[PDB]
Design a binder for this molecule. Structure first.
Ligand SMILES: C=CCC1=C(C(=O)O)O[C@@H]([C@H](O)[C@H](O)CO)[C@H](NC(C)=O)[C@H]1O
Ligand SMILES: C=CCC1=C(C(=O)O)O[C@@H]([C@H](O)[C@H](O)CO)[C@H](NC(C)=O)[C@H]1O
Ligand SMILES: C=CCC1=C(C(=O)O)O[C@@H]([C@H](O)[C@H](O)CO)[C@H](NC(C)=O)[C@H]1O
Ligand SMILES: C=CCC1=C(C(=O)O)O[C@@H]([C@H](O)[C@H](O)CO)[C@H](NC(C)=O)[C@H]1O
Ligand SMILES: CC(=O)N[C@@H]1[C@@H](O)[C@H](O)[C@@H](CO)O[C@@H]1O
Ligand SMILES: CC(=O)N[C@@H]1[C@@H](O)[C@H](O)[C@@H](CO)O[C@@H]1O
Ligand SMILES: CC(=O)N[C@@H]1[C@@H](O)[C@H](O)[C@@H](CO)O[C@@H]1O
Ligand SMILES: CC(=O)N[C@@H]1[C@@H](O)[C@H](O)[C@@H](CO)O[C@@H]1O
Ligand SMILES: [Ca+2]
Ligand SMILES: [Ca+2]
Ligand SMILES: [Ca+2]
Ligand SMILES: [Ca+2]
Lengths: 387, 387, 387, 387
């Protein structure tokens, strides 16, 4: 049975810890893949952590990783939420150096982009098999969300970019049923920049909070209808949520354009809350360290600086990294709304630390009808490793 | 289908070995989590061992564990009874430094308490997902059973404390259906102290045998009805079952108040047997070593010293530790009563032994219509380890 | 659904290799339990290898095993046929230093004997739980088959001994349904000796070929009806099948009494084939090395020396050990008879080899309508190990 | 339910990466079997990689493998596509130094050939059990496909050879239902040579593209009808696809006979595409290195040199090896034709590299309605290993 993820996202006052895998701690001894982007998506029966591996283990010469991000070895794999990315519980998903995954209520759909920078191919899998392909359309690192795509009544939705890391690139929305591409749309966005979208369902539409890597320290926002009509803009709020970013007090916010004089970026997320917004960010303005979630009053629909809530989940003494959204299915929350949840990647090793290698672990959090006390559930491994 | 655990507990003459995981022996070489509290609970299809991990493995620098009990790394995980707490068979349960788990006949319910000492949050999971929360009510180490909670006709019951390790604290009963809190009750108990309750179903009510950490060397006893009305007191018998404790001959027992001049404690358990009681205890009065189960005649309802049976399960040459109750579902015993069972934790390493680290393994036992011969099924690893 | 294992055993001309686990080879590096008795039994869906472990791994100080056979650590565990006894695929079965397992078509029944030599307890499990117990009846190492018990139309049958390794002991048949003992019988056998029976179903009765450890170099034979009436005797054939044993040419065979002046023994097996018999034995008369199966014409019902077939499965250059029978369910062979199969244990390490430790691997074989060529599928590890 | 694999093979313009296991990279640290022939076959629910192991692990003295190819230790095992051949996810299949596997829509059928060169036995398994046998018919290394056999409406088909590696040998087709041999056929082919067939279903018949090890640098082709009538010949195209082979420009092709003056060979594959053909080959004419797939116009039915497409999947800087065909079931592609896919083995170690040992990893590819960009998804481990 296909999920209906037509409900409204749950209004929430805070976020409860769901899971912590401690994979780097464990991989000091265990057989743990060197990973990045430990992203989460859920079927009606369970939530899984997806991740990329270069086929190498923690504490093994292969972890060296002077090896290109976008290598022939990179694969998308998965375990159940909270499990470490260890070899012996891992399900193979796709050959991939860029991915999105999601479940329609019957099977898992995954997309992995691999191949040469100049003409990379995205292969869509459905039920553990290749079902369809998308080649590069602009021949400049075809890439995607690195988080959960979004299925609504059996049709699955995601966003890709193809174009420079910096200047103007091109962006498309893609639609699928049973792993077969049934629609696509180019996103009109001159002057604007979209990458690594963090999306979730809300009211029968798909909303995303993305990364502008060109000039924006505000994050773009998309609202994709089933048809493929969309509105695009920036997250209204008068508080910047990218990294790097300038001061809050030195920023005015905008619903239609990038505002800060920054290049670069980090994947992060945000959740509409009626007219309000919950926005994730690194506590640091410059580094991918510390992690905090703020609720801004009227932050989705206007240039608000009104902070309604703050919750620290990784303190500014500790490394953090990428973050993304997912939702709990109603068939698992048992609610009549979609519980917003997100994960946070906590990166260890190069470049910030002396090690030959680089991996991440995760902390996962869900919505909840209550104010949750500050804490830091940080990675915790003890570096450097044996090697 | 929800379990009916409305039956009477089985009358039993002794206890048969169910399982022994040998996890510390195995983890000399295998990839075995450093654990504590290897507690057992059963669905209608299987019995699982729950445990806490700090995300570290036996024989790995991370086992060091000069690391706070109540750390950001601590998670509740599970394997099938008798399996070691090894990485590759472990199911993630909750982020937690205090837990209870139980199954209602449809899904597993777990509660893990994590967060700061001053305002910790307990997250209830149901079906492998966050479904509800309880924040600290007194801002002093919100904590729970460290054994199996108790489901009766689909509503699940457990006991928490919030307050000093020593002096008067506060204690609540909590009720849930499908992971949603449906009731709660404060337990009136001045002069008395409740922690780490060991509970089981008996006659459509929940009975617990708990730990008084303030002044009692007798263990408290609760009887919780479906409503949340309860009687509370102390286990009547004229024999002390806590550790530390004084001599049997130097104690008179009481159904209503703590009796010995001891602080401190250990989790342990007891089973009503009509008017009789089976009581667990460490053979040592001072140390958590050796383990024995005694049957006292009239021990539940009066100040009896009448020992009906004794069974040694760990000899006084060997380390023991925490212990708790669970019951076998009728759907697995095939009886028309609830088979009482318990587990015993056998702690190795610091402080009793020279090692950088501390873990435990378990022995599990069930009820049975026969007198079972004395033995010691003790942990068995050979310390110190490589390190 | 309960199996009907009422059919006749299949007439067979030879035996095809089913499985080889290579667990000692693998455990040079992998995490492989030190095991003994890698015995096989089958449900209607799969065949599993059961084994005992002392909770220690190959290549780990714990493998030392100057440790008593009959220790507190010894547990019965299982994997799917052909898998190594590795930690991460192992299902826990029972606490045990002596076992039998079998499936009735609905659940697995296991029996593990543990406890003190003087009053050991056998715990019967059903569906992964304690369901019943048998204490020592003669207070001298209560013990059992170390191979597959036998279920016929939902009632399960096995044989135990209690008494000296040497002189007269006592022997019982035990009957069970859903893990509850429903019948028992003492076996009248003065002058005779029964241990380690290898049994299988044939024509709605249970037949076993056992080990006489007192004076017999012929193996005893039992035929147990559903009631518990039985005939007992020795395997008629004029060829000795125990180890140690004298020459074939120096033996006359007997259907009613032990014949050779040998103490000691080895578990082995035999299959009725109408009036014929297939008999297993070590190629060596003195050592547990080499393994061969012979078909004797009229060997079940008379003192025959007529060898109809011989098949070597381990050559006399290689260590062998225990062996036992099982049958393929009709629901898996797809035949209208019960395919006879057996396994052979191949023991490495002490005492025959310089190592601190002792383990075994297995080769498994099934019936088949054809003459199978001689070979040696022997253990294969390269000793001594790192240590 | 039995599969209908009666459909036409899908017409395809290129091949998308399905899976990459990185098992040699991983086995630098993980517990990875030393393998060969990582072949793929699919049930209606999943695709599995089959492989042979000698029971030894990467990085362990046992990997030495001065050990005969055709040893007593060699077993056929399997994992899910894309998983490494690691110990803890492996399903045991057969005792085997030569194999074929396939699923009929209800159970897995496997065949493993083991035993002495002079009289080897092939045991057919069905549902994880021995169901039937084939002994050597010519007493010269009875052997088979080393890739997916082929089930059509519940009857399963495969090809074996028995005879010299070089001169004339003998070749048979074998047919089975539920693991029982229901038909066989000798293949008339004087002057010709068949080994290691790569087969797939097309139009209710079985087509194979095989290895001539005697004199042919073209690959033989068989078309087996349900009856067991067949046409046999050589792949028509005017381009040689074996290794070793001469230049393309120095070859004329033939539909009926071997053409090049080469002995030796490599397993490879080809797919009919109406009248066209997709042909696999090593980029090297002399070495098993690099891998490319070419589409020849009219290549199946005539002596064409017309190259319609080329796709590189392993570049000529990298080791490659064996290759085979499988098809995606309609129940997983969701198409009304059979998606052609193939795998490529990438061999590391001896003899090409300085190591004591030899293993392989794989890349898997499927059909697809699009031109796929050149790349090299090559093995990637860093040799030599610790040892
Ligand atoms: C660990 C790497 C994370 C990672 C980062 C990151 O920002 O750190 O950048 C992505 C970008 O290159 C930019 O978004 C610029 O376009 C990149 N995607 C790929 C596949 O290139 C991804 O791998
Ligand atoms: C290995 C530790 C076991 C352990 C012990 C124990 O008595 O040894 O004490 C619990 C208490 O602190 C006391 O009951 C006093 O309140 C503690 N709970 C937490 C989470 O603090 C638990 O971790
Ligand atoms: C590796 C040991 C195998 C093993 C042997 C064996 O003959 O080698 O002997 C069994 C006997 O003692 C005898 O049959 C004499 O009664 C023993 N059973 C137990 C549990 O004592 C069993 O463990
Ligand atoms: C890694 C070995 C691969 C391998 C090769 C190969 O060509 O490399 O040759 C097969 C042949 O011997 C020939 O086809 C000649 O008949 C062989 N089959 C067996 C079992 O002998 C198989 O093992
Ligand atoms: C960190 C590390 O091991 N670097 C090695 C380096 O020694 C070598 O010279 C070069 C090419 O092999 O780059 C590699 O990454
Ligand atoms: C037992 C052990 O390794 N202790 C280390 C110690 O060397 C160090 O000085 C301190 C802080 O890192 O405490 C740590 O736990
Ligand atoms: C083989 C081996 O390690 N033996 C040790 C030995 O050194 C020790 O003196 C004794 C008691 O610990 O027996 C042990 O088994
Ligand atoms: C590469 C290797 O380890 N070779 C060993 C060699 O030392 C030994 O002399 C011989 C027999 O054991 O062949 C073995 O394969
Ligand atoms: Ca930016
Ligand atoms: Ca106390
Ligand atoms: Ca004897
Ligand atoms: Ca050739």
């Amino acid at each position: 049975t296909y999920m209906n993820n037509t409900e409204a996202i749950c209004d929430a006052k805070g976020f409860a810890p769901f899971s912590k895998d401690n994979g780097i701690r464990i991989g000091s001894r265990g057989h743990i893949f060197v990973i990045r982007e430990p992203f989460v998506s859920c079927s009606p029966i369970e939530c899984r952590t997806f991740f990329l591996t270069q086929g190498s283990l923690l504490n093994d010469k292969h972890s060296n990783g002077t090896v290109k991000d976008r290598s022939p070895f990179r694969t998308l794999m998965s375990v159940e939420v909270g499990q470490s990315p260890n070899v012996y519980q891992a399900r193979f998903e796709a050959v991939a150096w860029s991915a999105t995954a999601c479940h329609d209520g019957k099977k898992w759909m995954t997309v992995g982009v691999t191949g040469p920078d100049s003409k990379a191919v995205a292969v869509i899998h459905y039920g553990g098999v290749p079902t369809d392909v998308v080649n590069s359309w602009a021949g400049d690192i075809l890439r995607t969300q690195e988080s959960s795509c979004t299925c609504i009544q059996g049709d699955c939705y995601w966003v890709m970019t193809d174009g420079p890391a910096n200047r103007q690139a091109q962006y498309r929305i893609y639609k699928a049923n049973q792993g077969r591409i049934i629609g696509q749309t180019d996103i009109s966005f001159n002057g604007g920049h979209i990458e690594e979208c963090s999306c979730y369902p809300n009211d029968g539409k798909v909303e995303c909070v993305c990364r502008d890597n060109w000039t924006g320290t505000n994050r773009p926002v998309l609202v994709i209808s089933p048809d493929l009509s969309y509105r695009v803009g920036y997250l209204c709020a008068g508080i910047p949520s990218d990294t790097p970013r300038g001061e809050d007090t030195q920023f005015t916010g905008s619903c239609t354009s990038p505002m800060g004089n920054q290049g670069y970026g980090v994947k992060g997320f945000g959740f509409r809350q009626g007219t309000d917004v919950w926005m994730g960010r690194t506590i640091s303005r410059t580094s991918r360290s510390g992690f905090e979630i703020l609720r801004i009053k009227n932050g989705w629909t206007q240039t608000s600086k009104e902070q309604i809530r703050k919750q620290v989940v990784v303190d500014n003494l500790n490394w953090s990294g990428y973050s993304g959204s997912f939702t709990l299915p109603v068939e698992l929350s048992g609610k009549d709304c979609l519980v917003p949840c997100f994960w946070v990647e906590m990166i260890r090793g190069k470049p910030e630390e002396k090690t030959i290698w680089t991996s991440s672990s995760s902390i996962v959090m869900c919505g909840v009808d209550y104010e949750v006390a500050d804490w830091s559930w940080h990675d915790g491994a003890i570096l450097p490793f044996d090697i």
